């Protein structure tokens, strides 16, 4: 979990103009940068509670230290989700279906986000991806410095 | 439907990975810039200091 | 528990070539002659007094350490500075485009002033839009 020094460092990186404030539109990005993964719903509740267009470091610390799920806390739910989508029982999903779900349903990702995700994903000659490897990439990839 | 709901956790974890990736890059750049800044600023402050000149002369003799 | 301190201790030891554990005014004069550093009388008294915080005529290692630390604490080892430049020159070119570092060193971290960034250029912008950075590094570790 991010130390106080790591939280400050992160905040300062987001606070490009050094005025001690970061736009509320970047709160999700900043939390995510330090290994906590709010859903859109959760983030919206947090933003609504802040009732502000920007936040300071003290606030960021307070918000971040709450029990927002880390990536390992999401493994079970992700694997359950992918298993429910697994037609063949072989641990794969078609990358085309994955792209569609990410982009068109739920808390839809942007095209740019989806291309960055898929750049690191091995696709077979029948267009299949191993979803546990994908989950593993999401959970273990780019850990805290 | 129910699919919209179950994929939200995958979307949340996917956003997390993208941001952690972006942040590693941004942090590496900021940390490196800081090291360079700190070294330049220090050097410009001590470059004509007699103790620096002496220390700099001795440095090659040190283990 | 620190590489800076060990280096300052090694330097102090070289300056303590009589092996007394301290540097007198007499000894500092000899040290300056040994290493070929020229200091005018006023600057000599100033440098001695800077180091001799207790004002007793003898510079102990902790006094020297405190002084050197005050002026040099934010510097790093040669390797750490080299690696920091390597962020902005991932291949081994030894060169960084001046428009790329300028936006980095002026906007990120503890931002440099244009005059500090200009003095820095005065060292390592040998061509018209390129910084060699080894010209800067080597001025600190020759
Ligand atoms: Ca700001
Ligand atoms: Ca003394």
From Swiss-Prot, chain A:
One GO cellular component, as annotated: myosin II complex
Sorted alphabetically, which SMART domains does this protein's record hold?
Answer: EFh
Q: Which residues carry this modification: N-acetylthreonine?
A: 1
Query: What name is this protein filed under?
Result: Myosin regulatory light chain
Q: Other remarks on record?
A: This chain binds two moles of calcium.
Q: Which residues bind Ca(2+) 1?
A: 15, 17, 19, 21, 26
Organism for this UniProt entry? Physarum polycephalum
- Tell me the GO molecular function terms: calcium ion binding
Query: What keywords are annotated for this sequence in UniProt?
Result: Acetylation, Calcium, Metal-binding, Motor protein, Myosin, Repeat
Lineage: superkingdom: Eukaryota
UniProt-listed SUPFAM superfamilies: EF-hand
Q: Where is coiled-coil annotated?
A: none
> InterPro entries recorded for this chain?
CALM/Myosin/TropC-like, EF-hand-dom_pair, EF_Hand_1_Ca_BS, EF_hand_dom
Which residue range or ranges hold the EF-hand domain? Answer: 2-37, 73-108, 109-144
Presence of the UniProt keyword Nucleus in the record: no
Residues the record lists as binding Ca(2+) 2: 86, 90, 92, 97
What Gene3D superfamilies does this protein's entry cite? EF-hand
